[PDB]
Scaffold this motif. Structure first.
Motif, PDB file in Angstrom:
ATOM      1  N   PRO E 116      -0.939  14.371  -8.045  1.00  0.00           N
ATOM      2  CA  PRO E 116      -0.734  13.722  -6.571  1.00  0.00           C
ATOM      3  C   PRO E 116      -0.090  12.014  -6.842  1.00  0.00           C
ATOM      4  CG  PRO E 116      -3.187  13.568  -7.501  1.00  0.00           C
ATOM      5  CD  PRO E 116      -2.427  14.700  -8.329  1.00  0.00           C
ATOM      6  N   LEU E 117      -0.135  11.850  -8.204  1.00  0.00           N
ATOM      7  CA  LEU E 117       0.345  10.291  -8.265  1.00  0.00           C
ATOM      8  C   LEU E 117       1.945  10.472  -8.627  1.00  0.00           C
ATOM      9  CD1 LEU E 117      -0.749   7.742  -8.741  1.00  0.00           C
ATOM     10  CD2 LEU E 117      -0.816   8.000 -11.286  1.00  0.00           C
ATOM     11  N   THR E 118       2.668  11.695  -8.725  1.00  0.00           N
ATOM     12  CA  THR E 118       3.814  11.741  -8.908  1.00  0.00           C
ATOM     13  C   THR E 118       4.748  12.852  -7.812  1.00  0.00           C
ATOM     14  OG1 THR E 118       4.037  13.416 -10.440  1.00  0.00           O
ATOM     15  CG2 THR E 118       3.574  11.423 -11.234  1.00  0.00           C
ATOM     16  N   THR E 119       3.875  13.596  -7.154  1.00  0.00           N
ATOM     17  CA  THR E 119       4.557  14.488  -6.197  1.00  0.00           C
ATOM     18  C   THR E 119       4.018  14.497  -4.762  1.00  0.00           C
ATOM     19  OG1 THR E 119       2.774  16.291  -6.319  1.00  0.00           O
ATOM     20  CG2 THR E 119       4.087  16.035  -8.214  1.00  0.00           C
ATOM     21  N   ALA E 120       2.882  13.518  -4.574  1.00  0.00           N
ATOM     22  CA  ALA E 120       2.567  13.534  -3.248  1.00  0.00           C
ATOM     23  C   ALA E 120       3.386  12.678  -2.100  1.00  0.00           C
ATOM     24  CB  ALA E 120       1.086  12.689  -3.113  1.00  0.00           C
ATOM     25  N   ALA E 121       3.436  13.174  -1.090  1.00  0.00           N
ATOM     26  CA  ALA E 121       4.293  12.721  -0.095  1.00  0.00           C
ATOM     27  C   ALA E 121       3.517  11.635   0.859  1.00  0.00           C
ATOM     28  CB  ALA E 121       4.666  13.929   0.961  1.00  0.00           C
ATOM     29  N   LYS E 122       2.217  11.519   0.859  1.00  0.00           N
ATOM     30  CA  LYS E 122       1.615  10.547   1.672  1.00  0.00           C
ATOM     31  C   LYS E 122       0.415   9.990   0.907  1.00  0.00           C
ATOM     32  CE  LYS E 122      -0.037  12.715   5.811  1.00  0.00           C
ATOM     33  NZ  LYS E 122      -0.385  11.094   5.950  1.00  0.00           N
ATOM     34  N   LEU E 123       0.268   8.467   1.286  1.00  0.00           N
ATOM     35  CA  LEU E 123      -0.688   7.689   0.701  1.00  0.00           C
ATOM     36  C   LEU E 123      -1.535   7.078   1.556  1.00  0.00           C
ATOM     37  CD1 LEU E 123      -1.490   5.675  -2.004  1.00  0.00           C
ATOM     38  CD2 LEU E 123       0.111   4.104  -0.757  1.00  0.00           C
ATOM     39  N   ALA E 145       2.289   2.484  -7.880  1.00  0.00           N
ATOM     40  CA  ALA E 145       2.333   3.465  -8.713  1.00  0.00           C
ATOM     41  C   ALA E 145       3.938   3.820  -9.009  1.00  0.00           C
ATOM     42  CB  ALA E 145       1.915   4.796  -8.252  1.00  0.00           C
ATOM     43  N   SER E 146       4.524   2.572  -9.412  1.00  0.00           N
ATOM     44  CA  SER E 146       6.088   2.492  -9.488  1.00  0.00           C
ATOM     45  C   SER E 146       6.672   3.303  -8.441  1.00  0.00           C
ATOM     46  CB  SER E 146       6.335   3.283 -10.866  1.00  0.00           C
ATOM     47  OG  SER E 146       6.591   4.626 -11.022  1.00  0.00           O
ATOM     48  N   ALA E 147       6.526   3.301  -7.518  1.00  0.00           N
ATOM     49  CA  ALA E 147       7.009   3.782  -6.154  1.00  0.00           C
ATOM     50  C   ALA E 147       7.137   2.900  -4.956  1.00  0.00           C
ATOM     51  CB  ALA E 147       6.736   5.081  -5.759  1.00  0.00           C
ATOM     52  N   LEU E 148       7.978   3.332  -4.035  1.00  0.00           N
ATOM     53  CA  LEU E 148       7.942   2.390  -2.823  1.00  0.00           C
ATOM     54  C   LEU E 148       7.561   2.976  -1.616  1.00  0.00           C
ATOM     55  CD1 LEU E 148       9.653  -0.473  -2.589  1.00  0.00           C
ATOM     56  CD2 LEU E 148      10.886   0.519  -0.800  1.00  0.00           C
ATOM     57  N   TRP E 177     -13.538  -3.566  10.138  1.00  0.00           N
ATOM     58  CA  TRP E 177     -12.769  -3.887   8.916  1.00  0.00           C
ATOM     59  C   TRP E 177     -12.585  -2.647   8.077  1.00  0.00           C
ATOM     60  CZ3 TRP E 177      -9.186  -6.227   6.961  1.00  0.00           C
ATOM     61  CH2 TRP E 177      -8.962  -7.427   7.519  1.00  0.00           C
ATOM     62  N   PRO E 178     -13.355  -1.574   7.832  1.00  0.00           N
ATOM     63  CA  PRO E 178     -13.000  -0.484   6.809  1.00  0.00           C
ATOM     64  C   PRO E 178     -11.468   0.080   7.226  1.00  0.00           C
ATOM     65  CG  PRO E 178     -15.167  -0.365   6.952  1.00  0.00           C
ATOM     66  CD  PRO E 178     -14.624  -1.264   8.082  1.00  0.00           C
ATOM     67  N   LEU E 179     -10.423  -0.767   7.242  1.00  0.00           N
ATOM     68  CA  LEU E 179      -9.236  -0.382   7.720  1.00  0.00           C
ATOM     69  C   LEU E 179      -8.473   0.818   6.698  1.00  0.00           C
ATOM     70  CD1 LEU E 179      -7.212  -3.456   9.185  1.00  0.00           C
ATOM     71  CD2 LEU E 179      -8.951  -1.923  10.210  1.00  0.00           C
ATOM     72  N   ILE E 180      -7.647   1.892   7.432  1.00  0.00           N
ATOM     73  CA  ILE E 180      -7.167   2.829   6.917  1.00  0.00           C
ATOM     74  C   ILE E 180      -5.474   2.907   6.944  1.00  0.00           C
ATOM     75  CG2 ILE E 180      -6.999   5.289   6.302  1.00  0.00           C
ATOM     76  CD1 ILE E 180     -10.129   4.317   8.008  1.00  0.00           C
ATOM     77  N   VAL E 181      -4.739   2.719   5.866  1.00  0.00           N
ATOM     78  CA  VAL E 181      -3.519   2.564   6.091  1.00  0.00           C
ATOM     79  C   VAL E 181      -2.760   3.850   5.383  1.00  0.00           C
ATOM     80  CG1 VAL E 181      -1.229   1.185   5.340  1.00  0.00           C
ATOM     81  CG2 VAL E 181      -3.586   0.031   5.829  1.00  0.00           C
ATOM     82  N   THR E 182      -1.850   4.247   6.315  1.00  0.00           N
ATOM     83  CA  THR E 182      -1.033   5.488   5.858  1.00  0.00           C
ATOM     84  C   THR E 182       0.416   4.972   5.718  1.00  0.00           C
ATOM     85  OG1 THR E 182      -2.558   6.783   7.234  1.00  0.00           O
ATOM     86  CG2 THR E 182      -0.400   7.847   6.583  1.00  0.00           C
ATOM     87  N   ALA E 183       1.156   5.616   4.616  1.00  0.00           N
ATOM     88  CA  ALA E 183       2.342   5.398   4.358  1.00  0.00           C
ATOM     89  C   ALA E 183       3.130   6.741   3.798  1.00  0.00           C
ATOM     90  CB  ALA E 183       2.331   4.264   3.137  1.00  0.00           C
ATOM     91  N   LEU E 184       4.370   6.371   3.671  1.00  0.00           N
ATOM     92  CA  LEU E 184       5.422   7.662   3.443  1.00  0.00           C
ATOM     93  C   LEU E 184       6.013   7.049   2.192  1.00  0.00           C
ATOM     94  CD1 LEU E 184       6.644   9.165   6.670  1.00  0.00           C
ATOM     95  CD2 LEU E 184       4.418   9.667   5.291  1.00  0.00           C
ATOM     96  N   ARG E 185       6.266   8.163   1.303  1.00  0.00           N
ATOM     97  CA  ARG E 185       7.198   7.791   0.163  1.00  0.00           C
ATOM     98  C   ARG E 185       8.721   7.481   0.381  1.00  0.00           C
ATOM     99  NH1 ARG E 185       4.583  10.315  -4.731  1.00  0.00           N
ATOM    100  NH2 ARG E 185       4.991   9.180  -6.510  1.00  0.00           N
ATOM    101  N   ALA E 186       9.268   6.387   0.087  1.00  0.00           N
ATOM    102  CA  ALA E 186      10.576   6.004   0.603  1.00  0.00           C
ATOM    103  C   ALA E 186      11.439   6.602  -0.303  1.00  0.00           C
ATOM    104  CB  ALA E 186      10.723   4.553   0.800  1.00  0.00           C
ATOM    105  N   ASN E 187      12.742   7.132   0.113  1.00  0.00           N
ATOM    106  CA  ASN E 187      13.758   7.684  -0.831  1.00  0.00           C
ATOM    107  C   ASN E 187      13.491   8.890  -1.512  1.00  0.00           C
ATOM    108  OD1 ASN E 187      15.141   5.114   0.056  1.00  0.00           O
ATOM    109  ND2 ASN E 187      14.092   4.243  -1.663  1.00  0.00           N
ATOM    110  N   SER E 188      12.098   9.151  -1.745  1.00  0.00           N
ATOM    111  CA  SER E 188      11.746  10.245  -2.473  1.00  0.00           C
ATOM    112  C   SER E 188      11.330  11.694  -1.822  1.00  0.00           C
ATOM    113  CB  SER E 188      10.861   9.870  -3.595  1.00  0.00           C
ATOM    114  OG  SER E 188      11.132   8.484  -3.717  1.00  0.00           O
TER     115      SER E 188
END
Ligand code: ZN
Ligand code: ZN
Ligand code: ZN
Lengths: 187, 78, 103, 586, 190
Positions: E116-123, E145-148, E177-188
């Motif tokens: 998951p650290l190198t192949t997942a699409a969502k964080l 994790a050395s990604a954007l 306050w227990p906020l949940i942030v969703t992001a996508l791998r950019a360029n990858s």
RNA sequence: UGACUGCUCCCUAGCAUGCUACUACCG
RNA sequence: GCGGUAGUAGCAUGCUAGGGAGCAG
């Protein structure tokens, strides 16, 4: 168990044998009478216990079904039961602050947030008529929940600020009445 | 006897509040849980009463919820 | 249970200054309690032992555990009570332990 | 679980396994329910069936009560006593039971398919609660035989008001007009999706728009029905006249524009319930407002079955008297938002039989009570515990169509609970208000059924239309389209200049649907012309066998006019002494 | 229980013997009656007992075989469910990045914690408070994790949408306050 | 959403053993 | 005349199976 044909047969045999024996007789008659009596006696004695076991088992089954029905009924009125119980205990407690706030809410003056306990922090209530304002707010101090508070703001249903001097007996009935007092807890 | 009564009343009040779908608001539910847990651990009967006032204010400041007046006319709360 | 409480009160219980009082209740917890309780594994640290002393303590412990017998048993000699309990993840989406002990 | 069987006055936990409403029958009562007919299955707190795995016994007459369970005949551990024995069925209340003298109430009316006239006959020969059971079973059979037809759907869409429509697998289609609203749901892949309310009459499929729609692929339209819950309050209140005018808020002024109001005001002063038998123009237009002004603060509730008939009063119920004192709530359905909607707190709460909550009230003034069973009366008497009642209505105002009629038309008097009472004990008020309807209708209609109550108030200028005609018929699967009298109506309207300002009502919407293609007169339905009465009218019948030319099903729809009418009749029964101006066919 | 093979003989013998008794014959016929009826009832006894034992044995056998069949049906359906779950979760493996990192391994084995650290699409990020928030995911794009990664959505403990314009120091005490942030791998990957 | 063990009470069903009783067969 | 055997009924004893509940680590 005197409502079965076996009981009738056994009783007739008992009476006949007893009468014959009390009259006095030989051996063969006694032997024949007892051989015709014991089978009927066993016939009676079997049912005499079978009926008892059946009756007690039926009673237990009806008991169990009543219990199940009552539990199913009870687990379907919990909201109303709990509310009634809570207000009964609230009566029995007999506290002045609780009574004050319960009567205030019963007449229409409810709060808008959690009542603070510190010497600071804001409290907001709604005053829907002039009589409640007359009872609670007199001067520039506020009495609520057996405490003392200091008025600092009055807001109407149109959200315009109303100064304290404005509110009066005949001077009030030209206003949006659901006022919102914001005060802080006096020391 | 004036302390166990308030603890039982607090338990009943928290049950009533939970029945009204209060735990669908995390902040309000956390405050209510904190107050309820603090009342049961009290040792003197003044802090328990002020916390009881604070906890009852949560139920009173919900317009629709329940009928204060009907529940006061059933030979119940004055 | 209000009836039992009233019955107990009507018999001289829960008076002021008594030596018997309630201190066992059902406590309620808020949303972020499971993770807060799981976070107590931070007290587990890697620990090195004195091996020459552990190798003797283990012999003494084995001497303590000496009056029993054991071994492996077949699948038809296993005794299970209350087969109506959870089976874990992800097996709890389809049934209890009875389903997997029968299938 | 624990309900009530009342004919034997017996609380019960039992119920018939195979019956209409899962009816509640006590031990002996379930027994003569299961020996007088064939209902060999019952339901208790738990259902009676053998509990060994794999066993199957539907019958109860041979089950046994075993070790805290039930066992059976074919698979028989018989260490028990039989369940059905000694004139009773095993259950709670096995001792506090009475029984029934009339053995065949259910065995008579709950055993037929709930469509014969005998059902309603016995329902009127019942008690209040027995007839409540009857009315609820009529609603149940209405829904349970409505849920046996198809679901219309549009799969490829065309221009609005002209589409295509395929239906279902093998099922028949119900009647055709807007009586059945086609309000279904749409499916994307597994769920239900916003669709709206539709109605199919003309089919190329012409639709009438209750709303403006953008139909997509597959959209399904059908009435999905629930079941009406049991009701807990009686329909009619027993007749008890008041001691005095105690507890009233009297007024000083007296209504003058209404010439038959003061005595009836006093009547409401000491009358507890009030029903009368009247066409349009019988105080329904102005007497309600008369009471509203004559007692200002009284909690008076009004209601009609549809909002457009509530509107007939509510449109100026806020003009005659202040706005701040009326309301009716609108669910979202064709309802009018004129009043203070979403507001329970009011004084003169108008209402619709379909929906209103219960807070409190004191005086009842309810409009038509026609097109429903005792549900309408009971929901509104449960709605409020009132000190005064005015059941405005008529057994012939909008007489409830008895779904698929098969056996004749019953006497009009035999309505829900009050109309048979109505002219066996007399009209509750002295009231007739013919200030819109003329005497040309009143003559015939009062000579037929409404004797001597309505007045011949307004004269006629000899324009009422007569033309002797027999006619020919042509029917469809659910409606019929008329050649003759339609053509005669056309060629009659071509003679008079000022006659193209009328309505074109139809026994089924097919008539106006066909006519809109070449002339285009507005759509009208015989279902409910709710609070919309106009003077000049074109009436049509097409096919009139059992629903139209029988009794006063629409004799109120014959009370169309104010100074002039047209009422086409293709039979020779409702003309016996009618004296419309005799003119020859063109 | 009434048409057993010995029932006919027993009943006929009983009827004949009792008719002979009702005939008022000598005592020899009575003794013969008694002996014959005694042996007849004795022989009827086992014929009435063994049959009742056998019926209960047969019923128990039927019940056991029925429950065995039910167990087999349940096993079949649970097997189908497990197969469906596995084949459904198979379809999200992202079979190009996974293949790219598998082939770089010297024998095909890789630790599970780095997939998951190198192949997942969502964080997904869970933030306790604002001080932690401003150090981890401040702005609109952050690095981990050395990604954007670039933010896509923010919700709160009640699962309601929250806009980044109101996550400030002053407005902090007004949020669950227990906020949940969703992001996508950019360029990858996504 | 409901873990692993141990002990105890209550109810029903079956099995085994024993006690007594009632008939019948055999010597 | 005594014993054996075969069914039937009541009672007692210990296991197995099913269900409901309580406490402890
Ligand atoms: Zn039935
Ligand atoms: Zn009955
Ligand atoms: Zn069975």
């Amino acid at each position: 168990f005197s409502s079965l044909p076996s009981y009738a047969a056994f009783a007739t045999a008992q009476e006949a044998y007893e009468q014959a024996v009390a009259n006095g007789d030989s051996e063969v008659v006694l032997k024949k009478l007892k051989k015709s009596l014991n089978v009927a006696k066993s016939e009676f004695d079997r049912d005499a216990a079978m009926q008892r076991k059946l009756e007690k088992m039926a009673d237990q089954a009806m008991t169990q079904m009543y219990k199940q029905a009552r539990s199913e009924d009870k687990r379907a009125k919990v909201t109303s039961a709990m509310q009634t119980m809570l207000f009964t205990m609230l009566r029995k407690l007999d506290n002045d602050a609780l009574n004050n706030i319960i009567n205030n809410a019963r007449d229409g003056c409810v709060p808008l947030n959690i009542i603070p306990l510190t010497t600071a922090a804001k409290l907001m209530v709604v005053i829907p008529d002039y009589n409640t304002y007359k009872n609670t707010c007199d001067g520039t101090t506020f009495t609520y929940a057996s405490a003392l508070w200091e008025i600092q703001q009055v807001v109407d249903a149109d959200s315009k600020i109303v100064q304290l001097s404005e509110i009066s007996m005949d001077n009030s009935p030209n206003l949006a009445w659901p006022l919102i007092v914001t005060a802080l807890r006096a020391n | 006897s004036k302390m166990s009564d308030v603890k039982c009343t607090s338990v009943v009040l928290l049950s009533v509040l939970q029945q009204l779908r209060v735990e669908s608001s995390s902040k309000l539910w956390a405050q209510c849980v904190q107050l309820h847990n603090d009342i049961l651990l009290a040792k003197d009967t003044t802090e328990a009463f002020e916390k009881m006032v604070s906890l009852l204010s949560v139920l009173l400041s919900m317009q629709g919820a329940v009928d204060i007046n009907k529940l006061c006319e059933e030979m119940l709360d004055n | 249970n209000k009836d039992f409480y009233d019955f107990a009160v009507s018999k001289g219980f829960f008076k002021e200054g008594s030596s018997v009082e309630l201190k066992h209740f059902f406590f309620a917890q808020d949303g972020n309690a499971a993770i807060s309780d799981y976070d107590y594994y931070r007290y587990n640290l890697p620990t090195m032992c004195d091996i020459r002393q552990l190798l003797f303590v283990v012999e003494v412990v084995d001497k303590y555990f000496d009056c029993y017998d054991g071994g492996c048993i077949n699948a038809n000699q296993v005794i299970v009570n209350n087969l109506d309990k959870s089976a874990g993840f992800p097996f709890n989406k389809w049934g209890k332990a009875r389903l997997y002990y029968d299938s | 679980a624990v309900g009530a069987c009342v004919l034997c006055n017996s609380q019960t936990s039992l119920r018939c396994g195979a019956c209409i409403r899962r009816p509640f029958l006590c031990c002996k009562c379930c027994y003569d329910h299961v020996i007088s007919t064939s209902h060999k299955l019952v339901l208790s707190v738990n259902p009676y069936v053998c509990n060994a795995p794999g066993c199957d016994v539907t019958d109860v007459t041979q089950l046994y009560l075993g070790g805290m369970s039930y066992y059976c005949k074919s698979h028989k551990p018989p260490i028990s006593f039989p369940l059905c024995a000694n004139g009773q069925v095993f259950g709670l209340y096995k001792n506090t039971c009475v029984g029934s003298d009339n053995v065949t109430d259910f065995n008579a009316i709950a055993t037929c398919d709930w469509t014969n006239a005998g059902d309603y006959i016995l329902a009127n020969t019942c008690t209040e609660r027995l007839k409540l059971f009857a009315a609820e079973t009529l609603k149940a059979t209405e829904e349970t035989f409505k849920l046996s037809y198809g679901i219309a759907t549009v799969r490829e869409v065309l221009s609005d008001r002209e589409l295509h429509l395929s239906w279902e697998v093998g099922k028949p289609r119900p009647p055709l007009n807007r009586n059945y609203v086609f309000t279904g749901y749409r499916v994307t892949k597994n769920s239900k999706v916003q669709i709206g309310e539709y109605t199919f009459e003309k089919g190329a499929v012409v639709y009438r728009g209750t709303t403006t729609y953008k139909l997509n692929v597959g959209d399904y339209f059908v009435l999905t029905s629930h079941t009406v819950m049991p009701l807990s309050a009686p329909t009619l209140v027993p007749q008890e006249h008041y001691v005095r005018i105690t507890g009233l808020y009297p007024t000083l002024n007296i209504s003058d524009e209404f010439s038959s109001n003061v005595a009836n005001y006093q009547k409401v002063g000491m009358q507890k319930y009030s029903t009368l038998q009247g066409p349009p123009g019988t105080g329904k237009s102005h007497f309600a407002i008369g009471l509203a002004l004559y007692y200002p603060s009284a909690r008076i509730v009004y209601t009609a079955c549809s909002h457009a008939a509530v509107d007939a009063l509510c449109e100026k119920a806020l003009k005659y008297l202040p706005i701040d004192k009326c309301s009716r709530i609108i669910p979202a359905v064709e309802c009018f938002d004129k009043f203070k909607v979403n507001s329970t707190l009011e004084q003169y709460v108008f209402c619709t039989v379909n929906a209103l909550p219960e807070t409190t009230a004191d005086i009842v003034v309810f409009d038509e009570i026609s097109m429903a069973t005792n549900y309408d009366l009971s929901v509104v008497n449960a709605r409020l515990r009132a000190k005064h009642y005015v059941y405005i209505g008529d057994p012939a105002q909008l007489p409830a169509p008895r779904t698929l009629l098969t056996k004749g038309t019953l006497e009009p008097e035999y309505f829900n609970s009050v109309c048979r009472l109505m002219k066996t004990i007399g009209p509750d008020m002295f009231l007739g208000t013919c200030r819109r309807c003329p005497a040309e209708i009143v003559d015939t209609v009062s000579a037929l059924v409404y004797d001597n109550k309505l007045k011949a108030h307004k004269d006629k200028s000899a324009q009422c239309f007569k033309m002797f005609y027999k006619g020919v018929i042509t029917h469809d699967v659910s409606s019929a389209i008329n050649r003759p009298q339609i053509g005669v109506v056309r060629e009659f309207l071509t003679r008079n200049p000022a006659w193209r300002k009328a309505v074109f009502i139809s026994p089924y919407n097919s008539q106006n649907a066909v006519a809109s293609k070449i002339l285009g007169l507005p759509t009208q339905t015989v279902d409910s012309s709710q609070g919309s009465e106009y003077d000049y009218v074109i009436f049509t019948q097409t096919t009139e066998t059992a629903h139209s030319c029988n009794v006063n099903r629409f004799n109120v729809a014959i009370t169309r006019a104010k100074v002039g009418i047209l009422c086409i009749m293709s039979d020779r029964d409702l003309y016996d002494k009618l004296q419309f101006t005799s003119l020859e066919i063109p």
